[PDB]
What does this fold into?
Amino acid sequence: PALTENGGRVNRVGFTRIQLIGSIKKFGFFYEWTQEAMDFDTDEELDS
Amino acid sequence: TYTKKPGIETVSYADPYGEMGLTSIKWYYGSLILRPEWIALFKTVA
Amino acid sequence: YSDVDAILADGKQAVAVKHGGGLVVVGELGAQVLAAKDVSELPDGV
Amino acid sequence: YSDVDAILADGKQAVAVKHGGGLVVVGELGAQVLAAKDVSELPDGV
Amino acid sequence: YSDVDAILADGKQAVAVKHGGGLVVVGELGAQVLAAKDVSELPDGV
It folds into this structure.
């Protein structure tokens, strides 16, 4: 950006920015069981 | 009024993850006209 | 059909199953065939 | 059908629907079609 | 069918009934019939 002795409109610059985008999702899972499967099971700490 | 907010309640085999709410309004209405001759009504066209 | 929104967005409805399994999806004929007493109330299709 | 008793009085059964709306109506024929495994177990009419 | 276990062993699945009582049982061929959105969506029903 060299300027002469006179001056004036000689060197215009610019500035830019940027945007960052993030998203949030939902997740999950489940498991079911019956009382008989906990009572008459070969083990005793199946739930644990 | 019966309100069940999502959370520990409203979880079941329908939805293990409680993500539904509920609010029900129930009432009981009934009326008796003792003296219908004291009730006056006129019909007309505007 | 990927998510529970897919059935809902499509207009197809889903019922929670009790005995074992996930959900049963119902379409409007599938509901209307479902609500038939005798041969008369099935769709034109069946 | 106007009221919930109409389905009961008619003889159709009524299942509550969770995810979307509710109250799908089942008739004996519709159930028997709905209870079919292979082409042999559907009713005569279909 | 006698008991709920006989259902699951057969592979037939069943749902609960709120307004009227009973265990409506879903078959194999019933589901896609029950899930159809249009006449082309039946699984070779009619």
